[PDB]
Each structure stands twice: as structure tokens, then as C-alpha cells.
Symmetry: D2
Subunit: 121 residues, 4 copies
Amino acid sequence: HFDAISAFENYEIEKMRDGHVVVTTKVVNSSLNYYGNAHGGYLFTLCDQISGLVVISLGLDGVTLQSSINYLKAGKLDDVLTIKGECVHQGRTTCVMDVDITNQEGRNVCKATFTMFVTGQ
Amino acid sequence: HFDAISAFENYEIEKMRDGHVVVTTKVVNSSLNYYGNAHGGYLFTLCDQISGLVVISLGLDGVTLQSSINYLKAGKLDDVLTIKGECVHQGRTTCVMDVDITNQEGRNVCKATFTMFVTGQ
Amino acid sequence: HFDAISAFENYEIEKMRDGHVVVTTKVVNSSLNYYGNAHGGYLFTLCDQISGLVVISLGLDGVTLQSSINYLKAGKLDDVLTIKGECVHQGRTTCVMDVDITNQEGRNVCKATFTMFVTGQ
Amino acid sequence: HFDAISAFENYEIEKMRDGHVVVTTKVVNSSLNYYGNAHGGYLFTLCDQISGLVVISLGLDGVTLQSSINYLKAGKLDDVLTIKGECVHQGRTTCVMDVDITNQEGRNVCKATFTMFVTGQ
């Protein structure tokens, strides 16, 4: 037995300008796994939503084909995690997005790369 | 503006036997993005939780170092997604887990691979 | 200083049918790193080429957008490696190819997944 | 039938200091695929080796557990490729290395991320 995992119960869009996104969010009880760290799932889901926001700030609509993430340091209750997203390559129909998460201390929680297929404009 | 994404509001553990896991879950409104498909985040988070369940069914405790996922077909409201997890390699301190999601039709929604660092026994 | 790294000084194509490829090869010296182990780039190239072969067997042309690979066991000088690729998803615009490497002892060397951009017929 | 694929017939090591590596190289013929483009396995090997160099510059030994790579622009015969690796996370048990490839035109060829298992000092 285990309870549901949520993401984006709180958030703030600091910035969403031309394929550059920064969002801040406080870690809450919804975010943690059985060990009381931020759930990998939860952390992915932060990075993924922000990659969708990069796509949108480019004026495009899009879908993620594939993604990779590296977990570096665990997130803890009450961290202000900040989510920094940027298009590192804009092809014709596919886009590569780099998302990084750091905290209030400036340490790095995780990194992820998104390969999107652009579906419309 | 956009609302929170949840995973595992409903679930059923069909099987959790020696590094083999199968969990079923119905897609709900919590699971969908602005286009009404299952959120990549949500889908990752299903695969990731089930990889944590594989680790546990091996008698280990563990942490994910890195993960990759490929999205194949979108999930829709009211799909019974089934999540099939298996340890494809057990090293000394690291484990490789393959997770697949298929639906009620048997089509494939997504695939993911987890590289875990085993933290204890 | 280090010596050049090479791939496919020898091979046998056992099968090349409708998205299925089997190809074997004998690890030799230009396959190796400074530890006398089969180079990571070398096993990756074995995998990348057989994914290119899985795609040709399907009357298609394409370029790789993304690949992930996990290293399981070392290749040793003089190993016969069995390289298996199947296209696991055939999309309109993209295909995903699962490639595995086992050795002569059936032990598992290597697994990769390529995300392809289909470009020709 | 196809010809053997090769990597590092030539190179210059510009820097090799404290987790930072720069290395250049001239695309030649054994670097290429059947389309006359720099082979995916070839750019991967360039990246994999420079990650191995980033790790040596840090007084460490290690083996790769996982790598992800995105292909951005083709390498063309006769390109001078600039290969940059930095260790972006130094863990107790693992390190993550970001490697990029730009060409002589500053255009971006290639990006990869290696997840390493540290084994020696």
C-alpha cells in the first residue's frame, strides 16, 4: 500500500519568454515517496510540464517522443525547487529541450532532456 | 494556468513476485494534460513507481540514478493501463529495470528503463 | 595517448527480414579500451548499425534523433557477440528500435533503444 | 554489405584539467555511413571517449552504466569537430558527464550524457 503522487499543487511562473521557462514550486507531502524524498516521478513530471511550457513559449504545440533524466540529489519537504527549461535545438518537426532543477541552496536536484515532436503551430 | 497532475489515485497490484510486478490503473481526469491525453509526467510516474516495486520485490531498497522513456501512443480517459515491470539485470549495487505500459486493447502506450542504485537490503 | 577505436572489422548477418535483424561479430583488439575491455563506443556502434539495418529491412530510410544504452557485462577480447534488433514501435513519423547484445555464453552485454526520424521509403 | 566504422584516426587534446576536457578531430572517410554522413556510433564514440577522459582528469577510474545522446546536425566529411566534456555532478558512487560536439561553424552536432560507476582512485 501507498498513496497518490501529485505535482503542481503549488507553482509560480517566474518566466516564459521565447523558449525559456522558469517555474518555482514548494515541495509538499504529496511529492514524497515511502522514504520521504521527492518522488522521481514527481520530479520528472515537474521537468516534463516545463518542457511543454518551452514548446508553448516558442509558439508551437507539441508532444514528447522520448525523455531522459538524471537524479543527483534528493528533494525534501519544503524545498523551493526551481525548474529551468530551455530549447537547446529547434529542428523543423523536432525540438530538444533541456530542463534543470535546483533549489533554495542552489544545489542540483535533477536534469532532464526532452525530445519533442512538434504537432502544430 | 493549469491544474495539478496525479498518479495512483486508483491502482491494483496484480502481481509482485521476485522482481516481477504488474499493476493496473484506470486513467482519470487528474491524469490528463491541456490536450486531454495522459500526461507524459503521469505516465513516467506510473512506470517509476512500478520500478520501485520491482526493487522491493527483489528484497532490496533502492534509488533511481537515471531513466529513459519512449512514448508510443497516448493514453485516454478511462483506459485501464497495465504496468509491467521486470529486472532485466541485477548487478551488485546497480539494477536495470524494464517497465512497459499496455492497455485494455493491448496496444502499447509507453516503455521505460530504470537504472537503480541499490541503497540497502 | 590512446589508439583508435573501430567497429565491424568482421561480421555475419544471420537474418535481415521485416524489422528483424540478427548479426554476430568477434571482438578483436581495435574494439578495446585501455582496460582491455570492449569499448563503450564500440558496443554502441554495433547497436546503432543494427538499428540502421532493422530500418532498412522495413523498406525505410531514417536518421537517429535519440538513443539510450545500458552496459551490463564487459565484452572480452575474442568474444562472439550476437546482436539482435527489432523495431518495437512503427510510427507514422518515427520508429523505436530495441537492440540487445548477448555473448557466446548467453550472458547479456548490452541493451539500447533508438528513437528514429523516418525520412524515406 | 557496408565498411567498418572507426573513431579517432586523428585528434588534438586541447585541455585535460580537473573534470574538464576539450578534444578536436577531423571527420574522415571511416567516420561515415552509407549516406556520406558522420556515423551515429562514431559521434557517440567521440563522446564516450571524452567522458572517459573527463573522469581520468579527476584522478578516478570508472565504467559507464548508462548513456543518452541526441543528434542535432550531421557531421560532414572534412569537418573539424570540437568535443567538450565536463563532469556536471560528482557523486560518491557515480558521476554524470555532459559532452557536446560543435563543428568548425559553431553549429551544434551532438549532445550526450553519461552515467558513470566510479571504481578506482
